[PDB]
């Protein structure tokens, strides 16, 4: 089974999922010199209801804050999107050390971590499962985290880490102000890509914010104390869970800003 360890890591993924070498894989390196502004891009419209969050858990590959997507209370619209995309989950990627943990990298630079807000096209498809199999089915908002002062908006999440240390563990997580976690500026880059974890489906319209948010070194270290293994099973820490940048393959990276 896949993972981020030496024997089941990203370089080995093509062995289980041939699509790992697809033409629209994520993440990628964003080279600002090659980015083209597109006036046809609309401003992002983000409406998040704090009552949407339901639970947080350890999937074995990251922590997952799952939201109730039966309702249309939390949705993402605008940007490069056509229609409304319902909020589904929030998770985080990091590396074994502060100097290299983000999935997407900018001009050869890796941030310390990267937050992903996963949405699906509820306007066209019946469920996230089916949307995940369509080119225009998913939209993932990426937020870079860079080392800085402690971020009090992460406390709610970090306080639960011990209760979901083991893979499979979960605890109730509600009344979460996701919006306040985003940077003040929503300027972003967008390109067609895929999920960064198996099944690596190429159904994602990526929206990566340019402005990063802060996290202290102490805070980030807590996520590395999570295990990618289950209780009663041989232990292994989830010290790193980011996929290396993938070949752009001629895709166009667009900027919503000048």
Ligand X SMILES: CC(=O)Nc1nnc(S(N)(=O)=O)s1
Shortest Cβ distance from residue 28 to Zn ion (Å)?
13
Residue with smaller CB distance to ligand X, 68 or 216: 68
Give the list of residues 6+ apart from residue 211 with CB closer than 8 angstroms, or none.
Answer: 144, 183, 184, 185, 187
Smallest gap from residue 232 Cβ to ligand X (A): 25
Determine which helix (DSSP H) or strand (DSSP E) holds 75, and give its type and residue range.
strand 75-78
Residues 195-214, interacting with ligand X (CB under 6 A): 195-197
Whether 61 sits among the annotated catalytic residues: the reply is yes
Chain centre to alpha carbon of residue 158: 17
The catalytically annotated residue of 7, 12, 61, 104 is 61
Distant-in-sequence, close-in-space partners of 63: CB < 8 Å, separation ≥ 6: 56, 57, 91, 92, 157, 160, 161, 164, 223, 226
241: contact with ligand X by CB under 6 A: no
User: Which H or E element spans position 128?
Assistant: helix 128-131
- C-alpha–C-alpha distance, residues 56 and 76, integer Å: 21
* Under rule CB under 6 A, residue 19 binds ligand X: no
Per CB under 6 A, 140 contacts ligand X: yes
Q: Rounded to whole angstroms, how far apart are CA atoms 26 and 247?
A: 8
Annotated binding site for substrate: 196-197
Which of ligand X, Zn ion, none is residue 89 near (CB under 5 to 8 Å by kind)? Answer: ligand X
Q: Which residues are annotated as a binding site?
A: 91, 93, 116, 196-197
Query: CA 160, CA 235: separation in Å to the nearest integer?
Result: 20
Contacting residue, 106, 112, 113, 118, with ligand X by CB under 6 A: 118
Instruction: Please choose, out of 24-32, 115-123, 170-178, 231-239, the segment that lies near Zn ion by the rule CB under 5 A.
Output: 115-123
CA torsion through residues 19, 20, 23, 27, sign:
positive
- The answer to whether 107 and 30 have CB atoms below 8 angstroms apart is yes
Q: Smaller CB distance to ligand X: residue 61 or 169?
A: 61
The interface partner of residue 203, options being Zn ion, ligand X, none and the CB cut-off 5 to 8 Å by kind, is: none
Q: From its phi and psi, is residue 61 left (phi > 0), alpha (psi between -120 and 50) or beta?
A: alpha
Where in 40-59 is the site for ligand X (CB under 6 A)? none
Q: How many CB atoms lie within 10 A of CB 130?
A: 14
Select the residue interacting with Zn ion from 88, 116, 167, 210 (CB under 5 A): 116
Site size toward Zn ion (CB under 5 A) is 1
Which range in 26-34, 113-121, 125-133, 217-225 contacts Zn ion by CB under 5 A? 113-121
Residues that bind ligand X (CB under 6 A): 89, 116, 118, 140, 195-197
**Catalytically active residues, by annotation:** 61
Q: Which residues bind Zn ion (CB under 5 A)?
A: 116
């Amino acid at each position: 089974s896949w993972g981020y360890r030496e024997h089941n890591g990203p370089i080995h993924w093509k062995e289980f999922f041939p699509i790992a070498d697809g033409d629209q894989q994520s993440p990628i390196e964003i080279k600002t010199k090659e980015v083209k502004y597109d006036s046809s891009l609309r401003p992002l419209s983000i409406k998040y209801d704090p009552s949407s969050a339901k639970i947080i858990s350890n999937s074995g590959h990251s922590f997952n804050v799952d939201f109730d997507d039966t309702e249309n209370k939390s949705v993402l619209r605008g940007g490069p999107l056509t229609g409304s995309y319902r909020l589904r989950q929030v998770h985080l990627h990091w590396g074994s050390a502060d100097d290299h943990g983000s999935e997407h990298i900018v001009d050869g630079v890796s941030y310390a971590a990267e937050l992903h807000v996963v949405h699906w096209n509820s306007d066209k498809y019946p469920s996230f499962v089916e949307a995940a199999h369509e080119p225009d089915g998913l939209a993932v908002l990426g937020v870079f985290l860079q080392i800085g002062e402690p971020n009090s908006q992460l406390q709610k999440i970090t306080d639960t880490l011990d209760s979901i240390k083991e893979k499979g563990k979960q605890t109730r997580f509600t009344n979460f102000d996701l919006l306040s976690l985003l940077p003040p500026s929503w300027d972003y880059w967008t390109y067609p890509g895929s999920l960064t974890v198996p099944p690596l489906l190429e159904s994602v319209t990526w929206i990566v914010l340019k402005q990063p948010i802060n996290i202290s070194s102490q805070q980030l270290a807590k996520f590395r104390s999570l295990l990618c293994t289950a209780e009663g099973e041989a232990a292994a820490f989830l010290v790193s869970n980011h996929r290396p940048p993938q070949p752009l393959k001629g895709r166009k990276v667009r900027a919503s800003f000048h």
